[PDB]
């Protein structure tokens, strides 16, 4: 137990790890790599602490104005001036174009879905990088997006009129995407490759496509192919073929499956869906890393899950080539303000976690850039690059400290400027006021932004908690700040240059069981001209391409440059109650709606360690809780609790309301603990009491420092 190397002391789980599995390969000198290490600690802690501390700074100054200003409306312009004279709003600085090069073509062309998984769960990450290729049958068929209405439900059995049903919306899919020169996909009685070209046997006659520029390749004998590739957009569609199979004699062509390209890429979160509070939690989710950049990655089930081999095809000429067959992977380190053990100074205070995951994360994904004995067989970057998204930043000053950060650790690493590129998240007030700002400081690294609305919501709730009485969080959506923070970001992705170059994204979506819905209605955001969007699961990823064969995406950012259709002064609009009143049961309704979803997401966080929830809110609807939501809703009770529209003894009535509930859920687990009757002596129930009654203290409202304390104090109640 700990390992004293410069001025730190590191613990001997994380160091045996680095030492033994992580830099062997990188040809890196250990002993140069831990001295670079300290170097980097030591130079860039102070500079990265006097950020903090300007956010408390600047939030209480914030918090004072609104203090001296009660009830009068608020004058905007008053409030502009003084952003403007505090520097919690920067000039706009000069127009411009980034020039990041060295980025794989996932990121700059292709637009597509982004799946977002906890890199501490091997099968979610497996499941997730191999998420690049998924089945439309096995996405039609276990969702709602076919109803189980008149018909035909689901069973223990394969169903008929459902199958025919997913075999029918297919069809229809591949007519509107690669369209035949006349007909439809519907009467194909197979396919052949004569002469380079691709011909659909229709019953009455016989067709190659309207445009022969969408024949991609195929697998097999060219008047008898197992598989034909197409491709539409920029993404694949494979039709599988197999007369003579489970689904084969039932389809009129022989049809086995639509394999269709979804998960582009793919973000390795090491933070809002993840538990890692000390050293082995940290270890075990460099070690997924490891195990993704090597390719060596494996986890059980009676058989084993390993990643995708890349996928192999003949061309229409008749050349083998081959396509990607796992996604590209980003990496998502932790923000700037938690700190961690692991290592720690010669007085005994935590590092900043941010600056251990620059190095580490950085140092393992060199082996993910080369194919070798020693690096592992599967590689990651095409082009040599790391792409490490950072998120919850405040503002130019702290990009750029990133920036700077990032320099260092390729310097330490032995690796060329600007190789680990930077994924901006737009999800800080300070940071959607000046965002163009914070893109030219990384007009260099930069590959992507996204709106992140959930800790936007968070932070703009706690950025005006003194402000007055916030809305009901379902009513956030339709509120004019968060609607010009997404037309603003993706005007300012645009405007810096990102068509070709970089991605806009948008964020995700959390009703993981409602995929009709999702299909129904995320097709906003590629016609918004997100480049790419946030999805939950692999299958919503698969449903989610759908919109993107659909939506020329690249047309609508051509279409949408130049224009401006976002003001300074609707960003800065605060979603305020005005002088709206709501019913008793209204406030009883959303109270209890929070304390659910705070209960059922921190149980799972403090006790077991999971960083990501299937919740169901109050109104029976299974949603997608993280640290986020869990912010959201913590901010919005410190909000209505802090303007007098509940009291202490409600929100404790709540919870203790809605304790049982959340115990039935759970109550087909194993290592469950039921946080009743005694609700006083339950961690998880102090936890979620704390923050809320406590949010209103917390540094930007981060839910960071009580998760961690109360898991700390979990492992430490129960190691005995
Ligand atoms: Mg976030």
């Not at 250990?30 to 600690?41: L, N």
């Not at 062509?253 to 979804?262: M, P, R």
């Not at 909000?639 to 049982?660: C, F, K, Q």
Request: charged letters at 20%; a negative charge.
């Amino acid at each position: 137990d700990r390992v004293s190397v410069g001025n730190l002391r590191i613990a001997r789980v994380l160091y045996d790890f680095v030492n033994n599995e992580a830099l062997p390969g990188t040809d890196i000198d250990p002993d140069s790599f831990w001295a670079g290490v300290d170097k980097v600690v030591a130079d860039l802690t102070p500079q990265n602490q006097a950020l903090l501390n300007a956010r408390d700074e600047l939030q209480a100054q914030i918090d004072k104005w609104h203090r001296r200003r009660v009830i009068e409306p608020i004058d905007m312009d008053a409030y502009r001036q003084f952003l403007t004279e505090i520097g919690y709003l920067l000039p706009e600085p000069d127009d411009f174009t980034i020039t990041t090069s060295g980025v794989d073509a996932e990121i700059t062309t292709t637009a597509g879905p982004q799946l977002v998984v906890p890199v501490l769960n091997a099968r979610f990450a497996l499941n997730a990088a191999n998420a690049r290729w998924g089945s439309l049958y096995d996405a039609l068929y276990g969702t709602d997006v076919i109803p189980e209405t008149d018909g035909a439900e689901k069973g223990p059995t394969y169903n008929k009129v459902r199958g025919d049903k997913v075999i029918a919306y297919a069809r229809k899919f591949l007519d509107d995407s690669v369209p035949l020169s006349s007909g439809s996909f519907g009467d194909a009685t197979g396919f052949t490759v004569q002469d380079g070209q691709l011909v659909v046997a229709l019953p009455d006659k016989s067709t190659g496509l309207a445009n022969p520029g969408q024949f991609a390749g195929y697998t097999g004998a060219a008047e008898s192919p197992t598989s034909v590739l197409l491709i539409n957009h920029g993404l694949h569609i494979e039709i599988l073929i197999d007369p003579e199979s489970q689904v084969g004699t039932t389809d009129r062509a022989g049809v086995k499956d639509v394999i269709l390209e979804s998960a582009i890429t793919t973000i390795m979160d090491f933070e809002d869906s993840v538990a890692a509070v000390d050293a082995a939690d940290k270890v075990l989710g460099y070690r997924n890393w490891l195990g993704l950049n090597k390719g060596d990655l494996a986890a059980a089930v009676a058989f084993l899950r390993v990643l995708n081999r890349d996928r192999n095809y003949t061309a229409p000429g008749g050349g083998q080539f081959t396509l990607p067959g796992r996604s590209l992977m980003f990496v998502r380190n932790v923000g700037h303000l938690m700190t961690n053990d692991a290592i720690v100074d010669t007085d005994g205070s935590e590092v900043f976690e941010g600056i251990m995951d620059a190095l580490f994360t950085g140092l393992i994904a060199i082996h993910g850039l080369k194919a070798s004995d020693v690096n592992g067989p599967l590689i990651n970057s095409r082009t040599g690059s790391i792409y490490i998204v950072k998120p919850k930043m405040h503002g130019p000053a702290e990009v750029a400290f990133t920036c700077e950060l990032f320099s260092r650790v390729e310097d330490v690493l032995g690796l060329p400027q600007n190789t680990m590129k930077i994924g901006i998240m737009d999800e800080e007030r300070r940071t959607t006021v000046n965002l163009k700002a914070c893109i030219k400081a990384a007009a260099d690294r930069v590959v992507f932004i996204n709106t992140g609305f959930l800790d936007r919501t968070g932070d703009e709730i706690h950025t005006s908690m003194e402000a007055g009485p916030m809305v009901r969080k379902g009513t956030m959506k339709s509120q004019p700040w968060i609607l010009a923070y997404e037309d603003h970001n993706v005007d300012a992705g645009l405007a810096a240059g990102f068509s070709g170059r970089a991605q806009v994204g948008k964020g995700m979506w959390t009703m993981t069981e409602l995929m009709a819905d999702m299909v129904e209605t995320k097709i906003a955001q590629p016609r918004a001209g997100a480049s790419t969007a946030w999805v939950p699961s692999p299958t919503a990823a698969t449903l989610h391409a759908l919109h993107y064969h659909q939506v020329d995406v690249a047309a609508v950012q051509q279409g949408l440059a130049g224009k401006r259709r976002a003001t300074i002064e609707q960003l800065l609009t605060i979603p305020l109650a005005k002088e709206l009143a709501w019913a008793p049961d209204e406030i009883r309704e959303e109270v209890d709606n929070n304390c659910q979803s705070i209960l059922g997401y921190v149980v799972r966080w403090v006790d077991q360690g999971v960083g990501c929830s299937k919740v169901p809110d109050i109104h029976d609807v299974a949603l997608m809780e993280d640290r986020a939501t869990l912010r959201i809703s913590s901010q919005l009770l410190a909000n209505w609790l802090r303007h007098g529209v509940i009291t202490s003894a409600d929100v404790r009535a709540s919870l203790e309301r809605m304790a049982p509930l959340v115990d039935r859920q759970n109550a087909g687990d194993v290592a469950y603990r039921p946080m009743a009757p005694n609700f006083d002596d339950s961690i998880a129930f102090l936890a979620a009491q704390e923050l809320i009654l406590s949010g209103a203290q917390q540094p930007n409202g981060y839910t960071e420092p009580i998760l961690h304390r109360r898991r700390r104090e979990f492992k430490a109640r129960a190691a005995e």
